[PDB]
Amino acid sequence: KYQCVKLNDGHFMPVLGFGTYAPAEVPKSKALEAVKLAIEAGFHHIDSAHVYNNEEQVGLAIRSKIADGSVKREDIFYTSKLWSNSHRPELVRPALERSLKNLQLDYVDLYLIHFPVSVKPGEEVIPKDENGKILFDTVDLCATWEAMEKCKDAGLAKSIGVSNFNHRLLEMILNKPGLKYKPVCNQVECHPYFNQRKLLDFCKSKDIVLVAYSALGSHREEPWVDPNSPVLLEDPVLCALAKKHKRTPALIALRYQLQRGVVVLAKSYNEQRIRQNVQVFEFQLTSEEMKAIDGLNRNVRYLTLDIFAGPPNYPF
Ligand SMILES: NC(=O)c1ccc[n+]([C@@H]2O[C@H](COP(=O)([O-])OP(=O)(O)OC[C@H]3O[C@@H](n4cnc5c(N)ncnc54)[C@H](OP(=O)(O)O)[C@@H]3O)[C@@H](O)[C@H]2O)c1
Ligand SMILES: COc1ccc2c(c1)c(CC(=O)O)c(C)n2C(=O)c1ccc(Cl)cc1
Known part of the structure; x- marks a missing residue:
């Protein structure tokens, strides 16, 4: 149980x-x-994507822990994501099947539209012209959603959702004539410096779960993240709350999300920190602590993908 x-x-x-x-x-x-x-630590939910270029490895890990008797496929919730070069409806299923082939799984638990701006079809995930301009494409995301709906009916995706969608783009899907399946989730950046209260309230009102990425303040990878942005985990209130709970600022930031009704991701390739992160189920924060973390909010968005800014569907 979990x-x-x-x-x-x-x-x-x-x-x-x-x-x-x-x-x-x-x-x-x-x-x-x-x-x-x-x-091994007790994660039952694994988040990946086509564009991460690790689906072979992550699929191998998963097949390995199933085959060795540690876990059943039914107790692993695996997410993939449809990259922007496969938004055209006819390219949706083949992209999911490519992912499944790379993973050697029969199905994904969740398939998300990764980012609402489209780019030109082909093998290249960031297609550019000769002068380095991104080759944007014009695709109706409602049609992409219909093709997503079909992958669910094919049983290739148990659930379907979206990522990096805003209010307008969610509404666009929710109001689609003939809508068959709402997005189960909207995976977006979410942390104590960017707490997404408004968007969170909106998703609750439609029974869409907000899934928090960069919940620990991001991979901080340049040039995608401004090295002058403050380091979330160095926050004195988070460090004071850690100290007081004999926990860590990481655990505080994750617990905060669970308690506000957010599903939270956490990446780590460090054995110690992987095991530490599951301790988020071993303690709780009081109302006063939660309000304290609320007060950290400051509209610091770490991740903008601004190489994809310009087209109308750019979400930020
Ligand atoms: N949908 C999207 O557009 C989108 C965007 C970005 C991310 N994602 C997803 O969300 C995941 C997490 O976001 P993210 O990679 O930005 O990083 P994140 O979880 O905020 O983690 C940031 C850093 O924290 C470190 N860390 C982890 N646990 C720690 C701990 N207990 N104490 C101190 N440091 C700790 C990690 O380093 P170590 O590895 O060394 O521990 C990691 O580099 C991604 O891997 C991906 O699956 C989705
Ligand atoms: C919304 O702000 C960002 C900024 C940068 C991002 C992403 C999201 C995502 C999406 C994610 O992490 O889920 C990726 C993968 N980013 C990259 O750094 C990147 C690296 C290599 C390639 Cl080939 C393409 C993109």
């Missing part, structure tokens, strides 16, 4: 997810070892 939340399609999502993205210069082998350790 702590899960019922999703709006009646499937269940473990409330603590293991993030698998590392910058490109971390060797891909380390994804294989970290996922296994994560499973």
Whole structure:
């Protein structure tokens, strides 16, 4: 047994997810070892994506811990994500099947539209022209959602959702004539310096779960993150609350999310910290502590993907 939340399609999502993205210069082998350790530590939710270029390794970890008798496939909740070069409806299923082939799994638990801006089809995840301009594409995301809906009916994705969507883009889907399946979730940046209260309230009102990424203040990887942004985990209120609970600022930041009804991801390729992060189920924060963490909020968005700014669907 482990702590899960019922999703709006009646499937269940473990409330603590293991993030698998590392910058490109971390060797891909380390994804294989970290996922296994994560499973061993008690993570039942594993978050990946096509664009992370680690689905072979993360799929191997998963198949390995199933085959060795440590866990059943039914007790692993695996997420993949549809990259922006496969938004065209006819390219949706093939992208999911490519992911499944790379993973050697029969199905994904959750398939998300990764980012609402589209780019030109082909093998390249960031297609550029000769002068280095990104090759944007024009795709109706409602059609992409219909093709997502079909992957669910094919049983290739048990649930479907979205990531990096804003209010307008969510509403666009929710109001679609003939809508068959709401997004079960909206995976977005969420932490004590960017707490997403408004967007969180909105998703609650539609029974969409907010899934928090960069919950620990991000991989901080340049140039995607401004090195002058403050380091979340160095916050004195978070460090004071850690100290007081004999926990860590990480655990405080994760517990905060669980208690406000957010599903929280946490990446780590360090054995010690992987095991530490599951301790988020061993303590609780009082109302006064929670309000304290609320007060940290400051509109610090770490991650903007601003190479994809300009088109109308850019969400930020
Ligand atoms: N949908 C999207 O567009 C999107 C965007 C970004 C991220 N994601 C997902 O969300 C996941 C997590 O986000 P993220 O990678 O930005 O990083 P994150 O979880 O905020 O973690 C940031 C850093 O914290 C360190 N860390 C982990 N546990 C710690 C602990 N207990 N104490 C101190 N440091 C700790 C990690 O380093 P060590 O590895 O050395 O421990 C990691 O680099 C990603 O891997 C991916 O699955 C989704
Ligand atoms: C919303 O702000 C960002 C900023 C940078 C991002 C992402 C999201 C994501 C999406 C995510 O992490 O889920 C990725 C993968 N980013 C990259 O750094 C990146 C690295 C290599 C390639 Cl080939 C393509 C993108």
